[PDB]
């Protein structure tokens, strides 16, 4: 889970690292790769807009599949791999049809499990179903907002949502941040809670590790010699049942 | 008559901003409102509790302060906003942050609609009546002056020689110095705070005059 380094130096005091106990491969697949260069917070004009960014190790994008839509054709999980772009782990699926894909890895996936997505799929980890079919009380992730897109909500590491009601032509869902809102009933969602749940206990432990991850130093405004910002006539306000007053 | 004491009360129809008062001589009444202040000796400024502090309120309070009149800041309509613990201090602290130039004024809360704590207004008024017209002994006042300048020996160097009072309302004081040019507005304000702390002098402005060596 979490590994603690012994204090053999001043820079290693209290540094903790992951364990990588859920990784079965060290090489990605050439087919599902694409170039991805780094921006320094600049834009099409070249001027800086976002501060505290830039630098870091080079990365390559992995083409995840947030849409599913491959009904029938049962698939078998082949491997679980580490992804540098996100905070979760990904899983490779060798569909019986022949085409291979990448999906988010929910907690509890073992190699060799048979997954299936569609209106007739059963309720178990890894499946994907429209919100109509799933019953009350389940924990789901990869929530969709409007039919046809892909997994907008609740897909970070160790986050989950819940289904509450089945009001007509909609569904009541409670999100990770205590939000309660209605979602169109024709949208899709995936069963289970995202894995790598111990990701938040990792101590960086050094000034250079954050530099590796791509974060630049922050200067306090003092030496630089509670107002809600959500719009007051914003749409989709009719769908917010219980506010995020926490 | 209140508590075997007579009183006179005047209303002034409100005051709005100078820039946007381009009315059809109906703003000619504001001159009448300004006149009442000259004939009055205690001023009650009223602010709404439902609405926050508006910039115009600070300007209006300026006229009373510059006239050397006792002021009692008053807020009305608590029936609108919540009445709860620490909601007392939310506006009590906010007023002090914004209304710095007047600090002597006591703060009173009452709502006219529900008639809550209305009878408490006059107890403020009578107390303010005395302080606007008060004299301190010449001996005592001088003895306090060089105690303040001793702990703050940072006035060439300005010299303090004498101090006394001239008027009852407001309490004017004159200090004889080698030269009034050396007087600094920061130091002049410093003298006022010590005097305002030696005695009560609550709810009334104070003015200090400076005279040369003569």
């Amino acid at each position: 889970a979490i590994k603690k380094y012994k204090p053999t130096s001043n820079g290693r005091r209290g540094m903790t690292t992951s364990d990588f106990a859920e990784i079965t491969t060290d090489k990605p697949e050439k087919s599902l790769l694409a170039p991805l260069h780094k921006k320094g917070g600049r834009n099409n004009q070249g001027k800086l807009t976002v501060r505290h960014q830039g630098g870091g190790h080079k990365r390559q994008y992995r083409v995840i599949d947030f849409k599913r839509d491959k009904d029938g054709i049962p698939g078998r999980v082949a491997t679980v791999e580490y992804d540098p772009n996100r905070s979760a782990n990904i899983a490779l699926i060798n569909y019986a049809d022949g085409e291979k894909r990448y999906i988010l890895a929910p907690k509890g996936i073992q190699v060799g499990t048979e997954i299936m997505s569609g209106p007739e799929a059963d309720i178990k980890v890894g499946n994907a179903l429209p919100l109509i079919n799933i019953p009350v009380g389940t924990v789901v992730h990869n929530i969709e907002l409007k039919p046809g897109k892909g997994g907008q909500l609740v897909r970070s590491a160790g986050t989950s949502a819940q289904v509450l009601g089945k009001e007509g032509k909609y569904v009541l869902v409670r999100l990770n941040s205590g939000e309660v809102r209605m979602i169109l009933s024709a949208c899709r969602a995936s069963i289970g809670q995202v894995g790598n749940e111990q990701h938040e206990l990792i101590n960086i432990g050094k000034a250079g590790r954050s530099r590796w991850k791509g974060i630049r130093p922050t200067v306090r405004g003092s030496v630089m010699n509670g107002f809600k910002t959500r719009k007051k006539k914003n749409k989709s306000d009719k769908f917010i049942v219980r506010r995020r007053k926490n | 008559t209140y508590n075997q004491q007579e009183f006179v009360i005047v209303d002034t129809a409100g005051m709005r901003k100078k820039g946007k008062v381009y009315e059809t001589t109906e703003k000619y009444s504001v001159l009448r409102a300004l006149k009442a202040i000259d004939r009055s000796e205690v001023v009650a400024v009223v602010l709404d509790g439902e609405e926050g502090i508006i910039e115009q309120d600070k300007r209006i309070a300026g006229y009373a302060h510059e006239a050397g009149k006792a002021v009692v800041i008053v807020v009305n309509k608590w029936d609108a906003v919540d009445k709860d613990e620490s909601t007392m201090k939310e506006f009590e602290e906010n007023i002090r942050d914004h209304f710095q130039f007047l600090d002597y004024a006591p703060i009173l809360f009452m709502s006219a609609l529900t008639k809550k704590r209305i009878h408490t207004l006059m107890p403020a008024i009578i107390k303010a009546s005395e302080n606007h017209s008060l004299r301190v002994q010449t001996n005592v006042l001088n003895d306090v002056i060089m105690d303040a300048v001793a702990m703050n020996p940072t006035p060439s160097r300005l010299k303090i020689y004498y101090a006394t009072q001239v008027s009852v309302k407001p309490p004017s004081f004159v200090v004889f110095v080698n030269d009034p040019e050396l007087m600094h507005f920061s130091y002049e304000r410093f003298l006022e705070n010590r005097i305002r702390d030696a005695f009560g002098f609550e709810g009334t402005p104070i003015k200090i005059f400076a005279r040369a060596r003569k």
Partner: protein, 267 residues
């Protein structure tokens, strides 16, 4: 012998005299281990027609019974005295009421004169290397004064406004220009309060050893892993080891001030 008397000590007297009028009350800090020898007659001659209280700081390192007896001796002498521990507030709560009771006469006279009561102005005075700055920092809870484990840290007097209730004046320690009784100088050097690079450490160690042998023979017996009481000093010095012939004197004086031994007093 012991002559240490720099120029800032000389300037401190003049400054105190020139700022005497503003003072309302005086606190005179006196070490508990040597209550009589720690008093300063030179500064006491300047200080008159002013109420004062004797304070016994570092009271945790001294024997309770002798300190309490000295407290009684000061009390029936005709002066108020108290026992205080600066590092952890032990008696710090019972000084503001004492000051109020002492100054109540002038306070009520002024009140009847027709003015609002004001803050109490106190001046702290004493010999160096006693808690005249740690006490202020504890009283103000702010850690505003500079403190160190050697004499002569502060160099200029400073005003500290503790709330709207107290105005404290701090002062560098003051020593009389010339000592008269060598035993007092020896005791002062043992307790600190001297630069320790101007004096002879060997005589200090000899005095400490003979006082220990006279008064606390059992504590000398336990010592640090050795049990003997011979006539000379070289027996104990070469306990744990060319070895330092007599530099171990520092060791002898090193632990005692840190209370490696139990609590004791010299009176």
């Amino acid at each position: 012998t012991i002559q240490w008397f720099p120029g800032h000590m000389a300037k401190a007297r003049r400054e105190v005299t020139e700022k005497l009028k503003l003072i309302d009350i005086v606190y005179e800090l006196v070490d508990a281990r040597i209550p009589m020898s720690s008093r300063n007659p030179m500064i006491e001659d300047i200080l008159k027609n002013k109420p004062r209280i004797m304070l016994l700081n570092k009271a945790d390192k001294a024997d309770a019974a002798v300190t309490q007896q000295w407290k009684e001796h000061f009390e029936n002498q005709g002066i108020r005295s108290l026992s205080i521990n600066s590092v952890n507030g032990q008696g710090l709560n019972q000084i503001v009421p004492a000051s109020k009771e002492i100054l109540q006469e002038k306070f009520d006279r002024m009140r009847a004169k027709g003015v609002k009561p004001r803050a109490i102005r106190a001046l702290i005075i004493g010999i160096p290397n006693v808690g005249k700055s740690t006490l202020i920092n504890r009283l103000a809870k702010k850690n505003i004064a500079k403190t160190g484990d050697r004499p002569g840290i502060t160099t200029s007097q400073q005003w500290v406004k503790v709330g709207k209730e107290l105005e404290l004046l701090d002062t560098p320690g003051i020593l009389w220009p010339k000592f008269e009784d060598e035993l007092v100088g020896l005791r002062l050097a043992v307790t600190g309060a001297i630069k320790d690079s101007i004096i002879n450490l060997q005589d200090v160690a000899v005095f400490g050893l003979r006082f220990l042998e006279e008064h606390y023979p059992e504590r000398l017996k336990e010592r640090y892993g050795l049990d003997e009481i011979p006539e000379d000093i070289a027996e104990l010095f070469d306990a744990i080891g060319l070895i330092n012939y007599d530099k171990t004197t520092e060791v002898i004086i090193r632990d005692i001030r840190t209370e490696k031994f139990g609590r004791l007093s010299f009176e």
